[PDB]
Amino acid sequence: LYSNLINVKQKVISIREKLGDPRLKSLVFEYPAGQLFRVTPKLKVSMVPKNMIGLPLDSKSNITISADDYYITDVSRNVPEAAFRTRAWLDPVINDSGVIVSGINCRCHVINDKSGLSYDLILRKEREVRV
Amino acid sequence: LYSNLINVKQKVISIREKLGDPRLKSLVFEYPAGQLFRVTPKLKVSMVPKNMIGLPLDSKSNITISADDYYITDVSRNVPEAAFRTRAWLDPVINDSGVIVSGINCRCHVINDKSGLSYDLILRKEREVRV
Amino acid sequence: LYSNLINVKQKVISIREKLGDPRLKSLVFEYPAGQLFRVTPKLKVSMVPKNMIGLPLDSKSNITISADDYYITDVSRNVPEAAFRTRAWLDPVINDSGVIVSGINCRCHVINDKSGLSYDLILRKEREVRV
Amino acid sequence: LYSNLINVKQKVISIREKLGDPRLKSLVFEYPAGQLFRVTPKLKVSMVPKNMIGLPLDSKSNITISADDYYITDVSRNVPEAAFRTRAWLDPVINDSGVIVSGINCRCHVINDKSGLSYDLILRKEREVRV
Amino acid sequence: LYSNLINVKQKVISIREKLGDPRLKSLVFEYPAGQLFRVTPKLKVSMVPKNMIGLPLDSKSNITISADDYYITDVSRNVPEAAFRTRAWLDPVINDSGVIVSGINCRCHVINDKSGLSYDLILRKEREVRV
Amino acid sequence: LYSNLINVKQKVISIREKLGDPRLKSLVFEYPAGQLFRVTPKLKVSMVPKNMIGLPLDSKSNITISADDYYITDVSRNVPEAAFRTRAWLDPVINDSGVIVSGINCRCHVINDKSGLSYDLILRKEREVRV
């Protein structure tokens, strides 16, 4: 069916969090304009190693940076597609208010959507991060 | 035989649309001069990730673009070959008239025709799109 | 034996034409000086995708072209070797005379002869074609 | 569980040191500010071959160096993550004091953390080493 | 033993010539200073495709050439090693005298000697050939 | 154990020399300062093909050379590690004295030590050789 398949995939994946593994990271998005959208499972993510590159703002400049990216493997399709056009945060903290203080700032760099029941995406860290 | 094989392939593939998967996208072509040709199955398509490149209009210019392409896997051979020389639209909308208002503009970039009973093609998005 | 093997290979391959597949293309050569040599089987051929390159006449010029090539897989060794040094035509038309009007002009670019009983060759389209 | 799994992995790996193999090297870190953190198992490490490169301090200079790196395969996750942000020493010697005299100076270059129960890391030798 | 193994390999390979295949080419060398050394089996050889390169005499010149090479697979180790330092001829003709009139001129470009009982070598055609 | 394993590996490999194969080459080192260290087995070695490169003494000069390297596969770990920092000779001749007259001069270029019971190394020929 592909409709209940994504939801059952979320239910079966929710077993992974009951086992304490350190690869699990909390991902949040800001899909609506002002407030946040959180992925339900505390999914796992790997880190592709860094590469030393020029600035993406101006490539032919003295300022250079290291591009750091994260590889998120099992992320449900139930999340809105337009969420991927908005900045994402890995391990964020929410206060008493609706804002976030600390976390690791990332932007969706490349989408892999070959599997029909889950997305898989790589997201690049911002050049300036909070923590 | 290869004649009825393409038609039976269309009939068996028409099962995929009865199952609700999000990878299915509607493809239309404009093979005749003025009006449209629609592929029968609501086939699936993947997105190859973007690459930052110079302008194809003038390569050695300040203006740069991102080349975005789509990978259409199961497309029948029953479609006319000359349709591939005309612009294509992914998820288009047809009004009361014969024209299209909105959709994602693409052009056939590379043809893979190794299989004798279906085409497989990658089509590059236009630099300017409607939606 | 390798002598009757090529001829039996031609006989068994002649079954493929009795089945209507669209990958079959008629190849002709002009091996003797003035008249034509036609390969017996209506063999199949794939199209390797195009690449944008400079002119082979002068590489460091403003004029650029797209190199288009065809991959012919099952072609018998019974054809003369020296035929491969002459221009080839894919889907040609012969009139009442011995000349050809229309067809797709190609030249043998690379030979693969690893198999002892058939050639396999890739042939590059001419920069100027008839149809 | 993933909690006792890392500790049992340390216990089973502690068998490797009871067998005398020469690939085993002692790794120490300086995770707290001033004193040292030693990995429990005398784990094995391979040497990726050297490459001749420019200076990382100034790339477009006359001074060039050879980048030498070590590939540490089985290293437990029980070590603090922040230890990887501090210099590491391969085969170090500790005196009567808390300082180290001799050893091979290295810095964590790339982290591979695909396995959920062990890290695997490559660490680049410093340009100036003690021994 | 490796001594009789090469000779038995020559005897068993001598079956291939009794079967008429077109991949068989006669190779001769000029290992002694003035007269010729012929390999015993009429071994087979494939043609790696051509590449357009600058002149090896002067690389940064207007004169360019195409490097054409041949891949000789089954060649016995019984031939002297020093024969490979001398020019080789594919399909040569010997007259009534000890000289050769026609043939395809080649020089040993790269040696593959991984197998302990046969050589395998690629030999590059000379820029100027006889036929 | 890994201690007797290297010695038994030397004993079992000493069978290879009792069979006459031409890939066996005698390797000697000069690990102590003045006299020689010979590897016990007459191990086999392959030749990686040559590459045309600039001078390693000055890269941006008119003088160019061909880098020739040898791939030594089965070499025991019982040899001292510091031997690899000294020049090596393939097929050397020892006179009545402790010096060597003729042989093929090589230097350890890259070490592969993934296997815990044998080294495997590639060693580059010197630009000037004796024979």
Side-chain angles (χ1 to χ4, degrees):
Chain A
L1 175 59
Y2 283 137
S3 316
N4 50 9
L5 264 296
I6 320 180
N7 319 320
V8 75
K9 178 74 171 303
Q10 298 261 64
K11 161 188 196 279
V12 303
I13 208 54
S14 295
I15 306 299
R16 189 128 69 180
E17 299 84 339
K18 292 166 27 169
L19 311 181
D21 81 99
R23 289 172 304 186
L24 309 190
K25 300 191 70 86
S26 189
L27 171 66
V28 81
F29 280 107
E30 309 164 0
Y31 153 79
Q35 83 287 9
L36 321 170
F37 186 89
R38 33 188 56 264
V39 305
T40 287
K42 289 272 302 307
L43 51 80
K44 77 187 213 69
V45 44
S46 299
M47 160 175 162
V48 48
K50 331 192 311 172
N51 60 320
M52 181 96 179
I53 61 170
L55 199 62
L57 196 136
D58 180 318
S59 41
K60 278 202 314 165
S61 67
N62 47 39
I63 298 181
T64 67
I65 49 138
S66 294
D68 285 1
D69 312 309
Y70 291 146
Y71 190 45
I72 295 206
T73 62
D74 309 80
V75 48
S76 166
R77 294 296 202 113
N78 279 10
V79 308
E81 166 281 341
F84 284 34
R85 284 202 274 289
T86 280
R87 60 152 42 90
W89 299 68
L90 273 84
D91 302 338
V93 297
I94 47 177
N95 49 14
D96 46 356
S97 101
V99 79
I100 56 196
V101 157
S102 154
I104 308 168
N105 312 349
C106 288
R107 307 213 194 141
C108 181
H109 188 55
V110 156
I111 303 95
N112 161 257
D113 51 351
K114 269 63 157 204
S115 52
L117 62 140
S118 191
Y119 286 122
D120 170 322
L121 80 158
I122 174 175
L123 69 178
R124 175 160 296 174
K125 283 176 46 196
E126 289 186 332
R127 295 167 253 166
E128 310 181 24
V129 297
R130 300 292 185 85
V131 298
Chain B
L1 175 59
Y2 283 137
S3 316
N4 50 9
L5 264 296
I6 320 180
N7 319 320
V8 75
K9 178 74 171 303
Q10 298 261 64
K11 161 188 196 279
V12 303
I13 208 54
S14 295
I15 306 299
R16 189 128 69 180
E17 299 84 339
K18 292 166 27 169
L19 311 180
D21 81 99
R23 289 172 304 186
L24 309 190
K25 300 191 70 86
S26 189
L27 171 67
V28 81
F29 280 107
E30 309 164 0
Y31 153 79
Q35 83 287 9
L36 321 170
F37 186 89
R38 33 188 56 264
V39 305
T40 287
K42 289 272 302 308
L43 51 80
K44 77 187 213 69
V45 44
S46 299
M47 160 175 162
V48 48
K50 331 192 311 172
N51 60 320
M52 181 96 179
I53 61 170
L55 199 62
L57 196 136
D58 180 318
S59 41
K60 278 202 314 165
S61 67
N62 47 39
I63 298 181
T64 67
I65 49 138
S66 294
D68 285 1
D69 312 309
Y70 291 146
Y71 190 45
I72 295 206
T73 62
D74 309 80
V75 48
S76 166
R77 294 296 203 113
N78 279 10
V79 308
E81 166 281 341
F84 284 34
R85 284 202 274 289
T86 280
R87 60 152 42 90
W89 299 68
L90 273 84
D91 302 338
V93 297
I94 47 177
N95 49 14
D96 46 356
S97 101
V99 79
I100 56 196
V101 157
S102 154
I104 309 168
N105 312 349
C106 288
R107 307 213 194 141
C108 181
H109 188 55
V110 156
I111 303 95
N112 161 257
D113 51 351
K114 269 63 158 204
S115 52
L117 62 140
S118 191
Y119 286 122
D120 170 321
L121 80 158
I122 174 175
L123 69 178
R124 175 160 296 174
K125 283 176 46 196
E126 289 186 332
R127 295 167 253 166
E128 310 181 24
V129 297
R130 301 292 185 85
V131 298
Chain C
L1 175 59
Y2 283 137
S3 316
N4 50 9
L5 264 296
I6 320 180
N7 319 320
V8 75
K9 178 75 171 303
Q10 298 261 64
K11 161 188 196 279
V12 303
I13 208 54
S14 295
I15 306 299
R16 189 128 69 180
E17 299 84 339
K18 292 166 27 169
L19 311 181
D21 81 99
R23 289 172 304 186
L24 309 190
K25 300 191 70 86
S26 189
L27 171 66
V28 81
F29 280 107
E30 309 164 0
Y31 153 79
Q35 83 287 9
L36 321 170
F37 186 89
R38 33 188 56 264
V39 305
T40 287
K42 289 272 302 308
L43 51 80
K44 77 187 213 69
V45 44
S46 299
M47 160 175 162
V48 48
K50 331 192 311 172
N51 60 320
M52 181 96 179
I53 61 170
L55 199 62
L57 196 136
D58 180 318
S59 41
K60 278 202 314 165
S61 67
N62 47 39
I63 298 181
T64 67
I65 49 138
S66 294
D68 285 1
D69 311 309
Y70 291 146
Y71 190 45
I72 295 206
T73 62
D74 309 80
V75 48
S76 166
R77 294 296 203 113
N78 279 10
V79 308
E81 166 281 341
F84 284 34
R85 284 202 274 289
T86 280
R87 60 152 42 90
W89 299 68
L90 273 84
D91 302 338
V93 297
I94 47 177
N95 49 14
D96 46 356
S97 101
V99 79
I100 56 196
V101 157
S102 154
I104 309 168
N105 312 349
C106 288
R107 307 213 194 141
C108 181
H109 188 55
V110 156
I111 303 95
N112 161 257
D113 51 351
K114 269 63 158 204
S115 52
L117 62 140
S118 191
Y119 286 122
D120 170 322
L121 80 158
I122 174 175
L123 69 178
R124 175 160 296 174
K125 283 176 46 196
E126 289 186 332
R127 295 167 253 166
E128 310 181 24
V129 297
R130 301 292 185 85
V131 298
Chain D
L1 175 59
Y2 283 137
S3 316
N4 50 9
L5 264 296
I6 320 180
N7 319 320
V8 75
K9 178 74 171 303
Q10 298 261 64
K11 161 188 196 279
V12 303
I13 208 54
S14 295
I15 306 299
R16 189 128 69 180
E17 299 84 339
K18 292 166 27 169
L19 311 181
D21 81 99
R23 289 172 304 186
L24 309 190
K25 300 191 70 86
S26 189
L27 171 66
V28 81
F29 280 107
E30 309 164 0
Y31 153 79
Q35 83 287 9
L36 321 170
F37 186 89
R38 33 188 56 264
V39 305
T40 287
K42 289 272 302 308
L43 51 80
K44 77 187 213 69
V45 44
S46 299
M47 160 175 162
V48 48
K50 331 192 311 172
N51 60 320
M52 181 96 179
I53 61 170
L55 199 62
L57 196 136
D58 180 318
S59 41
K60 278 202 314 165
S61 67
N62 47 39
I63 298 181
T64 67
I65 49 138
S66 294
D68 285 1
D69 311 309
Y70 291 146
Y71 190 45
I72 295 206
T73 62
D74 309 80
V75 48
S76 166
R77 294 296 203 113
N78 279 10
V79 308
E81 166 281 341
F84 284 34
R85 284 202 274 289
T86 280
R87 60 152 42 90
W89 299 68
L90 273 84
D91 302 338
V93 297
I94 47 177
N95 49 14
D96 46 356
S97 101
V99 79
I100 56 196
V101 157
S102 154
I104 308 168
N105 312 349
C106 288
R107 307 213 194 141
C108 181
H109 188 55
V110 156
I111 303 95
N112 161 257
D113 51 351
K114 269 63 157 204
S115 52
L117 62 140
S118 191
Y119 286 122
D120 170 322
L121 80 158
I122 174 175
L123 69 178
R124 175 160 296 174
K125 283 176 46 196
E126 289 186 332
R127 295 167 253 166
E128 310 181 24
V129 297
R130 300 292 185 85
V131 298
Chain E
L1 175 59
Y2 283 137
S3 316
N4 50 9
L5 264 296
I6 320 180
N7 319 320
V8 75
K9 178 74 171 303
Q10 298 261 64
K11 161 188 196 279
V12 303
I13 208 54
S14 295
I15 306 299
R16 189 128 69 180
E17 299 84 339
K18 292 166 27 169
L19 311 181
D21 81 99
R23 289 172 304 186
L24 309 190
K25 300 191 70 86
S26 189
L27 171 66
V28 81
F29 280 107
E30 309 164 0
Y31 153 79
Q35 83 287 9
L36 321 170
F37 186 89
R38 33 188 56 264
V39 305
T40 287
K42 289 272 302 307
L43 51 80
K44 77 187 213 69
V45 44
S46 299
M47 160 175 162
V48 48
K50 331 192 311 172
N51 60 320
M52 181 96 179
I53 61 170
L55 199 62
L57 196 136
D58 180 318
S59 41
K60 278 202 314 165
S61 67
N62 47 40
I63 298 181
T64 67
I65 49 138
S66 294
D68 285 1
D69 312 309
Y70 291 146
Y71 190 45
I72 295 206
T73 62
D74 309 80
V75 48
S76 166
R77 294 296 202 113
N78 279 10
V79 308
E81 166 281 341
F84 284 34
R85 284 202 274 289
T86 280
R87 60 152 42 90
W89 299 68
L90 273 84
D91 302 338
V93 297
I94 47 177
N95 49 14
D96 46 356
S97 101
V99 79
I100 56 196
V101 157
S102 154
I104 309 168
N105 312 349
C106 288
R107 307 213 194 141
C108 181
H109 188 55
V110 156
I111 303 95
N112 161 257
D113 50 351
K114 269 63 157 204
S115 52
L117 62 140
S118 191
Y119 286 122
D120 169 322
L121 80 158
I122 174 175
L123 69 178
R124 175 160 296 174
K125 283 176 46 196
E126 289 186 332
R127 295 167 253 166
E128 310 181 24
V129 297
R130 300 292 185 85
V131 298
Chain F
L1 175 59
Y2 283 137
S3 316
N4 50 9
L5 264 296
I6 320 180
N7 319 320
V8 75
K9 178 75 171 303
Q10 298 261 64
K11 161 188 196 279
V12 303
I13 208 54
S14 295
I15 306 299
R16 189 128 69 180
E17 299 84 339
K18 292 166 27 169
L19 311 181
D21 81 99
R23 289 172 304 186
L24 309 190
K25 300 191 70 86
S26 189
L27 171 67
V28 81
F29 280 107
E30 309 164 0
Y31 153 79
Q35 83 287 9
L36 321 170
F37 186 89
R38 33 188 56 264
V39 305
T40 287
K42 289 272 302 307
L43 51 80
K44 77 187 213 69
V45 44
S46 299
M47 160 175 162
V48 48
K50 331 192 311 172
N51 60 320
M52 181 96 179
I53 61 170
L55 199 62
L57 196 136
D58 180 318
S59 41
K60 278 202 314 165
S61 67
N62 47 39
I63 298 181
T64 67
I65 49 138
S66 294
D68 285 1
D69 311 309
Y70 291 146
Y71 190 45
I72 295 206
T73 62
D74 309 80
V75 48
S76 166
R77 294 296 203 113
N78 279 10
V79 308
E81 166 281 341
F84 284 34
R85 284 202 274 289
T86 280
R87 60 152 42 90
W89 299 68
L90 273 84
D91 302 338
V93 297
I94 47 177
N95 49 14
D96 46 356
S97 101
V99 79
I100 56 196
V101 157
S102 154
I104 309 168
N105 312 349
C106 288
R107 307 213 194 141
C108 181
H109 188 55
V110 156
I111 303 95
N112 161 257
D113 51 351
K114 269 63 157 204
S115 52
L117 62 140
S118 191
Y119 286 122
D120 170 321
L121 80 158
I122 174 175
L123 69 178
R124 175 160 296 174
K125 283 176 46 196
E126 289 186 332
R127 295 167 253 166
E128 310 181 24
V129 297
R130 301 292 185 85
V131 298

